[PDB]
Motif scaffolding. Structure first.
Motif, PDB file in Angstrom:
ATOM      1  N   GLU A 248     -30.915-113.463   4.279  1.00 33.77           N
ATOM      2  CA  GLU A 248     -32.192-113.004   3.732  1.00 33.77           C
ATOM      3  C   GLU A 248     -33.209-114.141   3.664  1.00 33.77           C
ATOM      4  N   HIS A 251     -34.506-114.809   6.992  1.00 32.94           N
ATOM      5  CA  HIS A 251     -35.388-113.729   7.418  1.00 32.94           C
ATOM      6  C   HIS A 251     -36.810-113.929   6.899  1.00 32.94           C
ATOM      7  N   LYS A 734     -36.216-110.933  -5.630  1.00 32.64           N
ATOM      8  CA  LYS A 734     -37.355-110.184  -5.101  1.00 32.64           C
ATOM      9  C   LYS A 734     -38.598-110.413  -5.952  1.00 32.64           C
ATOM     10  N   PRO A 800     -26.950-104.329   4.222  1.00 33.81           N
ATOM     11  CA  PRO A 800     -27.571-105.554   4.752  1.00 33.81           C
ATOM     12  C   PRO A 800     -28.491-105.301   5.931  1.00 33.81           C
ATOM     13  N   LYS A 801     -28.215-104.273   6.734  1.00 31.65           N
ATOM     14  CA  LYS A 801     -29.066-103.972   7.881  1.00 31.65           C
ATOM     15  C   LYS A 801     -30.404-103.391   7.440  1.00 31.65           C
ATOM     16  N   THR A 802     -30.395-102.567   6.392  1.00 29.97           N
ATOM     17  CA  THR A 802     -31.598-101.848   5.984  1.00 29.97           C
ATOM     18  C   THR A 802     -32.328-102.560   4.849  1.00 29.97           C
ATOM     19  N   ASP A 803     -31.623-102.850   3.758  1.00 31.89           N
ATOM     20  CA  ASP A 803     -32.250-103.449   2.588  1.00 31.89           C
ATOM     21  C   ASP A 803     -32.437-104.948   2.786  1.00 31.89           C
ATOM     22  N   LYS A 804     -33.694-105.378   2.825  1.00 30.81           N
ATOM     23  CA  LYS A 804     -34.059-106.780   2.953  1.00 30.81           C
ATOM     24  C   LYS A 804     -34.515-107.320   1.606  1.00 30.81           C
ATOM     25  N   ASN A 807     -39.141-107.407   2.524  1.00 34.60           N
ATOM     26  CA  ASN A 807     -39.429-106.390   3.526  1.00 34.60           C
ATOM     27  C   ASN A 807     -40.935-106.336   3.769  1.00 34.60           C
TER      28      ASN A 807
END
Ligand SMILES: CC(C)CCC[C@@H](C)[C@H]1CC[C@H]2[C@@H]3CC=C4C[C@@H](O)CC[C@]4(C)[C@H]3CC[C@]12C
Ligand code: ALF
Ligand SMILES: [K+]
Ligand SMILES: [K+]
Ligand SMILES: [K+]
Ligand SMILES: [Mg+2]
Lengths: 984, 268
Positions: A248, A251, A734, A800-804, A807
């Motif tokens: 994350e 990213h 977040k 993990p693929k969807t929730d960043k 975002n």
């Protein structure tokens, strides 16, 4: 693979050229030592600490700040070489940026995996000395020179030096807890028993020890070629991979770096289009780079992780790798070891059959459960028999310990009976004092029972009693009567059937069952003075009085069932991987809640429907037990089918590398897998798992070297606490990242408006560094102390693929709405300062060229007054200070609105005291920078008139009101357009 | 080695452009348009409210401009350094053009409306008419447009104007004057023409651009002569205000506060 137990005694000896009894010649031993190499495990090379810091120094924002420092030095060089009257501004800016990079690298270095010393731990398991036969003589030599094909003798607790093919054994037993995790001793015999070398009896493995007996064996593997040597090499070579929080972080670093690069290159080439000088262009680029990069974001994340780790360090949960904090929260699958991890690694009495009744005793280590009834006379007799036919005895000098947690000299069964009797009634020392043992007969391979004749409880001289323990269904073959509430009755067929039902029922729980009985002397025909030591005496032991049945098991820990239940409620699939036998594994799985009630396996369905297991449709059964032999030849695709369709999985009789295979199979479905174990066979699984958790008291040194987290008190609810704290820190990260990113826009926009509309610069680069490195640090850290908005243990594990972590919605919100409101507030303050001093906003358009010209000293304001370079520069620096204060003022409301993401800010109250201190410290630091003497020379900060502090108040109120209205819209329409676009 | 991005743009299914459909793109652009429109309206209203509190005659604060700077005219191209060739008219044409453009208000033709004021006395005007005193161009004798077409150029004796910065309601005390001296040992002669610097008090106080219409600030002109055969280049000359205590000229942070340093070089 590569089995040596198949070869006969001579076939093995001729392959290695070793004499059966003479041993190995010293010259041949030296030749083999020089041919194969020493008997040692080679540590894997480790990267020096010099490199790791350098590796951390070159990541993401660090490169942009390096470019900024290089450009600062270039700007200083250009300034000196051109105008020959340099100012020490760009040089100090470059030095400060380099120092910032170094400090951020230090913070990253702290927040990094600290490697492992697994191979050192295995080298503590090799013996220092070995008894070897050479030239027909015993000699004790250093274990490193032990070569293949020589007679090695082990006995009396000595650790096995290398993998041995046992050719002679006198009652030898070994502890195979390094290979199976189970500490019950295993008999070693020369004869071939099983195809698999691990379960065969004639092979003795390295890193194990001979608990009792003696054994002469032949070395079959040495050093890294041993079974445990290859496991050690595999564990050392493995890595945990990239933690989810690291992914994350990378990213959003990529996102922010891309935005910064785009803006920098676009506006730099634009500045070259506008015929800016090279010095002006590089100063503008430095400003853009500093404005875009969040200098204090990564240090804030490290501090939040450290604070959360310290929060769990208070609950006896030690976090070795700082990134492991959030991995438990992100976990969706937990692979759990059985012994030591889920169970207590201690054989404990579980059930008693007597009074024609089943009574369940307390198995918890803390004794929080209720006990059974002690009021029965036959219970008194059964307790006497159990505690008096027991050879085991407590070790001394430990009376200051709980009974269950104190060492005992004896077998696991004998110790279990001893401790159960001690808890239930009296003490065994006094029981032996009152009843003097006059003779005993120990356990026999052909008799399968143990007896002891001793003085009666009635104190009468003629009477003695024989107490016998043995196998349940066989011991009553000698018995003819039973005790029921202190009254004896003959053995009834209904009683026999009830005994059979009880034996199968207790045995059906995966427990070892034992039967205890006693007999009294009939009359004076056998006198007390008769010697019972006569071997093979003509006095058969028959017609006894059956007393009771006691069952034993390695019971689950007290908190394990509730912890498994909570984890399953949290959406976590809990799989059981054990090296123990399938029946005990299934029993423990049902006990702790791995396999829920009402769910059956394919074998159980077949048993219910009285059909072969082939006819049962495998899709019906939602639970499965997979034996290690089946897992061996099973292909990867078939393993993925078992994981996908079955919800309650138990893997049994698994080798250490098969645990690794199961962990990789679980991870193959894009899952974050957490492994809980306490043995050396779990170390490859602990290394490969996303997060490895090891127990503190029961864990071996290898397991805690291979793990990321240690349960210091062996409380299994710490897993629940860890996942809760991981989810909490993810949400709070977040919030903190949103707060830190919001203030970037009030720093980017002044430079863009500067280059577009040619107005005097509204914000300085040093001022930007004062914002991020200063007033933004404590408030951003304070978000780590936010409480959960709801029950976070109800939501499923995050994708993990969807929730960043970051975002598009977070970027959209922070950069597009709150950031722009803050920028408007700052620009309004700028315009107010300039207008009230003489420069009206219309006159500022196109004034950049003259305002920045050091030689034009008559710049005319809107009122006809003429200003010199320094006079107007003081006003510009006052505008910079006011812009900084305005950013602080709007960051007040930014902090307030970032306190929550769904609920009202005053709904949850001001439980966070750190946030209030953050507000006050931010304001105090702003005021101190503005009004401290000498700040006009150091940072070009200047005192602000009191009315100038209130310029940004309307925009802070707008931020608060807009966020409140948006939150209210979110709750009224949860599936609305506002929630799909603004909620992050 | 796979282009996951190519399908992301122009997705045939659902028609998603860059991960968002055509309808959602329209909604998000409309939302951001309305949001930024409301933000711009609020900013404009707040700016207008701030401007309503201001006065068009005199700035609210004057604490950042207490003393006048000193500046030279015309502004040289680089680093306040005058460079020209006596034999090359094109080198010094820009100075001539700037000087005639600046001195146009000062000639007798245009300032006929302006009134003659008694000399040596501060001219305080309580009235609202705010009439201005005239500055005759004959005060800059030999450096003015009437005497010669070229302001000392092509003769080796260039003329440069030194002017005091304008400040609203500033009343100099004492007798303000500007003295210019060469810095080098060759000491080329510098001659401020209207006697000494002699900034006359009758032009003060300045009452602003809006109120005091037709203001002409006092001007001091310098003439640095050079020999016909000897260029006498690279001469550094410094002017300052030393007749008034109110006008400070010893500041260290600001080198142009009450003083100015400029360089002259000549060819042939
Ligand atoms: C000084 C002024 C011009 C700055 C204006 C910045 C604006 C134009 C930029 C900054 C942040 C940007 C937004 C960032 C996030 C999103 C969400 C994405 O799904 C669509 C693009 C969108 C909506 C961007 C649109 C353009 C945007 C709003
Ligand atoms: F403790 Al185990 F397999 F049960 F290593
Ligand atoms: K920044
Ligand atoms: K790990
Ligand atoms: K920031
Ligand atoms: Mg274990």
């Amino acid at each position: 693979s590569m089995d040596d137990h198949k070869l006969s005694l001579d076939e093995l000896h001729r392959k290695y050229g070793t004499d059966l009894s003479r041993g190995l010649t010293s010259a041949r031993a030296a030749e083999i030592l020089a041919r194969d190499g020493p008997n040692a495990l080679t540590p894997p090379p480790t990267t020096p600490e010099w490199i790791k810091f350098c590796r951390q120094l070159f990541g993401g924002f660090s490169m942009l700040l390096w470019i900024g420092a290089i450009l600062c030095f270039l700007a200083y060089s250009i300034q000196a070489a051109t105008e020959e009257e340099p100012q020490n501004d760009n040089l100090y800016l470059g030095v400060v940026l380099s120092a910032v990079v170094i400090i951020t690298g230090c913070f990253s270095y702290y927040q990094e995996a600290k490697s492992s010393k697994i191979m050192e731990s295995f080298k503590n398991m090799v013996p220092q000395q070995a008894l070897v036969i050479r030239n027909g003589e015993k000699m004790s030599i250093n274990a490193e020179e032990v070569v293949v094909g020589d007679l090695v003798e082990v006995k009396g607790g000595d650790r096995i030096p290398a993998d041995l093919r046992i050719i002679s054994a006198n009652g030898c037993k070994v502890d195979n807890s390094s290979l199976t995790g189970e500490s019950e001793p295993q008999t070693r015999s020369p004869d071939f028993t099983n195809e698999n070398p691990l379960e065969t009896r004639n092979i003795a493995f390295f890193s194990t020890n001979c608990v009792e007996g003696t054994a002469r064996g032949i070395v079959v593997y040495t050093g890294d070629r041993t079974v445990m040597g290859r496991i050690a090499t595999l564990a050392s070579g493995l890595e945990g991979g990239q933690t989810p929080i690291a992914a994350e972080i990378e990213h959003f670093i990529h996102i922010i770096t891309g935005v910064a690069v785009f803006l920098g290159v676009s506006f730099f080439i634009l500045s070259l289009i506008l015929e800016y000088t090279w010095l002006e262009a590089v100063i503008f680029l430095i400003g853009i780079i500093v404005a875009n990069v969040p200098e204090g974001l990564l240090a804030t994340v490290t501090v939040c992780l450290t604070l959360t780790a310290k929060r769990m360090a208070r609950k006896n949960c030690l976090v070795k790798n700082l990134e492991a904090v959030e991995t438990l929260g992100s976990t969706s699958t937990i692979c759990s070891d059985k012994t030591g991890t889920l169970t207590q690694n201690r054989m404990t009495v579980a059930h008693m059959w007597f009074d024609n009744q089943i009574h369940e005793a307390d198995t918890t280590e803390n004794q929080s459960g209720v006990s059974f009834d002690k009021t029965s006379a036959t219970w008194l007799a059964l307790s006497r028999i159990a505690g008096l036919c027991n050879r085991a005895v407590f070790q001394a000098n430990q009376e200051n310990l709980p009974i269950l947690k104190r060492a005992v000299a004896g077998d696991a069964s004998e110790s279990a009976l001893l401790k159960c009797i001690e808890l239930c009634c009296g003490s065994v020392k006094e029981m032996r004092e009152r009843y003097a043992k006059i003779v005993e007969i120990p356990f026999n391979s052909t008799n399968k029972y143990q007896l002891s004749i001793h003085k009666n409880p009635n104190t009468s001289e003629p009477q003695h009693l024989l107490v016998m323990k043995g196998a349940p269904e066989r011991i009553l073959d000698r018995c003819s009567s039973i005790l029921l509430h202190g009254k004896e009755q003959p053995l009834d067929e209904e009683l026999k059937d009830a005994f059979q039902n009880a034996y199968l029922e207790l045995g059906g729980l995966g427990e070892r069952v034992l039967g205890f009985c006693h007999l009294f002397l009939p009359d004076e025909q056998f006198p007390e003075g008769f010697q019972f030591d006569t071997d093979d005496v003509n006095f058969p032991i028959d017609n006894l009085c059956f007393v009771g049945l006691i069952s034993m098991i390695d019971p689950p820990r007290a908190a394990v069932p509730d912890a498994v239940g909570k984890c399953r409620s949290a959406g976590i699939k809990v799989i059981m991987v054990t090296g123990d036998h399938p029946i005990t594994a299934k029993a423990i799985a049902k006990g702790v809640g791995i396999i829920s009630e009402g769910n059956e396996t394919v074998e159980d369905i077949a048993a219910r429907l009285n059909i072969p297991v082939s006819q049962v449709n495998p899709r019906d059964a939602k639970a499965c037990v997979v034996h290690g032999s089946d897992l061996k030849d099973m292909t990867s695709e078939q393993l993925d089918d078992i994981l996908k369709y079955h919800t309650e999985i138990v893997f049994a009789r698994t080798s250490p590398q098969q645990k690794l295979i199961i962990v990789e199979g679980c991870q193959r479905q894009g899952a974050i897998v957490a492994v809980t174990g306490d043995g050396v066979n779990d170390s490859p699984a602990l290394k490969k798992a996303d997060i490895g958790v090891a127990m503190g008291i029961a864990g071996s040194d290898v397991s805690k070297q291979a793990a990321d987290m240690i349960l210091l008190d062996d409380n299994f609810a710490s897993i629940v606490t860890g996942v809760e704290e991981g989810r909490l820190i993810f949400d709070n990260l977040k919030k903190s990242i949103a707060y830190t990113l919001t203030s970037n826009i009030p720093e980017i926009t002044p430079f863009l408006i500067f280059i577009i509309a040619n107005i005097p610069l509204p914000l300085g680069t040093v001022t930007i560094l004062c914002i991020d490195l200063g007033t933004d640090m404590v408030p951003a850290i304070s978000l780590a102390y936010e409480q959960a908005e709801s029950d976070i243990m109800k939501r499923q594990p995050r994708n993990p693929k969807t929730d960043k972590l970051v975002n598009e919605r977070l970027i959209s919100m922070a950069y597009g709405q709150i950031g722009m409101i803050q920028a408007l507030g700052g620009f309004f303050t700028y315009f107010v300062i300039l207008a009230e001093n003489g420069f009206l906003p219309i006159h500022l358009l196109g004034l950049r060229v003259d305002w920045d010209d050091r030689w034009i000293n008559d710049v005319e304001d809107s009122y006809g007054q003429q200003w010199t370079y320094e006079q107007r520069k003081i006003v510009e620096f006052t505008c910079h200070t006011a812009f900084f204060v305005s950013i602080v003022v709007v960051q007040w409301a930014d902090l307030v609105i970032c306190k929550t993401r769904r609920n009202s800010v005053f709904q949850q109250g001001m439980k966070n005291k750190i946030l209030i201190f953050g507000l006050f410290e931010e304001t105090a630091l702003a005021a101190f920078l503005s009004y401290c003497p000498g700040m006009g020379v150091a940072l070009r900060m200047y005192p602000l008139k009191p009315t100038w502090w209130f310029c940004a108040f309307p925009y802070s109120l707008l931020i608060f009101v807009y966020d409140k209205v948006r939150k209210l819209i979110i709750r009224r329409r949860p599936g609305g357009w506002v929630e799909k676009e603004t909620y992050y | 080695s796979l282009a996951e991005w190519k399908l992301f743009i122009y997705n045939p299914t659902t028609g998603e452009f860059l991960g968002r459909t055509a309808k959602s793109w329209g909604l998000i652009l409309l939302f951001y348009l309305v949001f930024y429109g409301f933000l711009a309206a609020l900013f404009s209203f707040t700016m207008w409210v701030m401007l309503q509190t201001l006065n068009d005659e005199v700035p609210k604060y004057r604490d950042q401009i207490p003393s006048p700077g000193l500046m030279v005219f015309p502004k040289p191209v680089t680093a306040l350094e005058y460079t020209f060739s006596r034999s090359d008219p094109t080198s010094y044409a820009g100075y001539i053009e700037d000087l005639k453009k600046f001195l146009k208000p000062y000639t007798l033709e245009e300032q006929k409306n302006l009134t003659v004021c008694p000399d040596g006395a501060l001219f305080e005007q309580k009235g609202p008419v705010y009439v201005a005193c005239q500055f005759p161009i004959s005060l800059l004798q030999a450096c003015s447009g009437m005497n010669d077409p070229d302001f000392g150029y092509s003769q080796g004796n260039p003329c440069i104007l030194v002017k005091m910065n304008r400040i609203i309601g500033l009343k100099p005390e004492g007798v303000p004057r500007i003295d210019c001296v060469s810095k080098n040992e060759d000491i080329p002669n510098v001659a401020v023409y209207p006697h000494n610097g002699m900034i006359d008090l009758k032009y003060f106080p300045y009452y602003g651009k809006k109120l005091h219409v037709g203001y002409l600030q006092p001007l001091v002109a310098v003439q640095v002569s050079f020999a016909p055969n000897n260029t006498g280049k690279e001469v550094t000359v410094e002017c300052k205000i030393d007749g008034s205590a109110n006008l400070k000229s010893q500041d260290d942070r600001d080198k142009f506060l009450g003083r100015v340093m400029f360089k002259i070089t000549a060819r042939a």
